[PDB]
């Protein structure tokens, strides 16, 4: 029974990094041969597992997280990293077991005059914990004066748009990201390779 990897990698709409999507992948045959055959991906980094021996490993559970960030922020989708993304949007644990796959999506996520659909959380009171999600739109009180839901001096909106332009260099173009989390519990495996 094939795992629905196409439903994640080949999805039509991708999430904004702050409101990142998650698909639980269970009770299926994970053929990573379809992802290894695809020349679209410019990043394939594994942690706690080998990419060559992925078609041999068995897991209790798999989680596929997907979202869009700028190319220069792809380095932030790794354990122990800092930045606006790792700190306020999507955090990986230090003890991470899984792979991080990214690919340039300038052909789909850029627009003439800029695409402003994609957002990222720019401000937050504290850093996110591994796999924490924050989709709140409450006004950030950067100063001492209370905002009371209104924007003003030191009272900023927490989300900021990326504005993907087709004129940008490779590092400033949008990238579609999939993060695979591998759960290896002391219980029977539901996901195995071929």
């Amino acid at each position, epitope marked *: 029974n094939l795992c629905p990897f196409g439903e994640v990698f080949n999805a039509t*709409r991708f999430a904004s990094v702050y409101a990142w999507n998650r698909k639980r992948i269970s009770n299926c045959v994970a053929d990573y041969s379809v992802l290894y055959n695809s020349a679209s991906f410019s990043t394939f980094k594994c942690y706690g597992v080998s990419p060559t021996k992925l078609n041999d490993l068995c897991f209790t559970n798999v989680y596929a997280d997907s979202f869009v960030i700028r190319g220069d922020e792809v380095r932030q989708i790794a354990p122990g990293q800092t930045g606006k993304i790792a700190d306020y949007n999507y955090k990986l644990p230090d003890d991470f077991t899984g792979c991080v796959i990214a690919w340039n999506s300038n052909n789909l996520d*850029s627009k*003439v*005059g800029g695409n402003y659909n994609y957002l990222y959380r720019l401000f937050r009171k504290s850093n996110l914990k591994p796999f924490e999600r924050d989709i709140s739109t409450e006004i950030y009180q950067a100063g001492s004066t209370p905002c009371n839901g209104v924007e003003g001096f030191n009272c900023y909106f927490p989300l900021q748009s990326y504005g993907f*332009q087709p*004129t940008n260099g490779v590092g400033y173009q949008p990238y579609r990201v999939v993060v695979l989390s591998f759960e290896l519990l002391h219980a029977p495996a539901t996901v195995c390779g071929p």
Partner: antibody
Framework: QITLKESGPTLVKPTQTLTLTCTFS??????????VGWLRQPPGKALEWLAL???????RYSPSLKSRLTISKDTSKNQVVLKMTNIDPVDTATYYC???????????WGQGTLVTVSS | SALTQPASVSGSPGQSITISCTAT?????????VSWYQQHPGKAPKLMIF???DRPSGISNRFSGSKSGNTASLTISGLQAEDEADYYC?????????FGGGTKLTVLG
């Protein structure tokens, strides 16, 4: 096959509003990364982009003509309409509508419609 | 205006010709999306090359694209009479889809 066709008046007087329609087929203006553009070519002159509308209704215009341009889509009728207010003699041109993707800029152009502006 | 092309280029059958497209400003950024259009009289523009050097399906391999800095080039090898047409380059600025002024190509008969 992806096809686009322009329709509208062949003669308009200055100060009036020119309304052109683009009837397309062979593709959906709902799929991500797809758009439809309106361009023009004055006789013996270069191609010039006027407006563009994306699958998500995000609209882009030529900054120098933005105040007079209005683009819209009708997903049900397969039409993309361009309205140009305060028409002037320099607006006499063949008007084209074309399929847009970031990668190609514009492909599958329509045959065009020569619009004459005269009082 | 944002892109500059020679007004005209000419060659004889069997030869190779090159049409340039120089970006006049920084507004094109990385200048990665460069398309070339062939336009015959009274006809609609036809996409010959996109993304500097990619060829749409059905376009002869005699047409090729390349770029050196801010100058993109369309090369046509084995020049044939039917190649005589207007050629336009196109790209993006931070606000618009722009075009060069066009180049009338003459194949001497």
């Amino acid at each position: 096959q992806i096809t686009l066709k322009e329709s509208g008046p062949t003669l308009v007087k200055p100060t009036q509003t020119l309304t052109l329609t683009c009837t397309f087929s062979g593709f959906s203006l709902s799929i991500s990364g797809v758009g439809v553009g309106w361009l023009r070519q004055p006789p013996g002159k270069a191609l010039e982009w006027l407006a563009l509308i994306y699958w998500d209704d995000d609209k882009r215009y030529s900054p120098s003509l933005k105040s007079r341009l209005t683009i819209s889509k009708d997903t049900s009728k397969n039409q993309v309409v361009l309205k140009m207010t305060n028409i002037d003699p320099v607006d006499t041109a063949t008007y084209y509508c074309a399929h847009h993707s970031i990668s190609t800029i514009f492909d599958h152009w329509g045959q065009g419609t020569l619009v004459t502006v005269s009082s | 205006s944002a892109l500059t092309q020679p007004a005209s280029v000419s060659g004889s059958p069997g030869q190779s010709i090159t049409i340039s497209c120089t970006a006049t400003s920084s507004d094109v950024g990385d200048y990665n999306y460069v398309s070339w259009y062939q336009q015959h009289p009274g006809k609609a523009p036809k996409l010959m090359i996109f993304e500097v050097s990619d060829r749409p399906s059905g376009i002869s391999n005699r047409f090729s694209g390349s770029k050196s800095g801010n100058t993109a080039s369309l090369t046509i090898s084995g020049l044939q009479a039917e190649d005589e047409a207007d050629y336009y380059c196109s790209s993006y600025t931070t606000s618009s889809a722009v075009f060069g002024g066009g180049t009338k190509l003459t194949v001497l008969g």
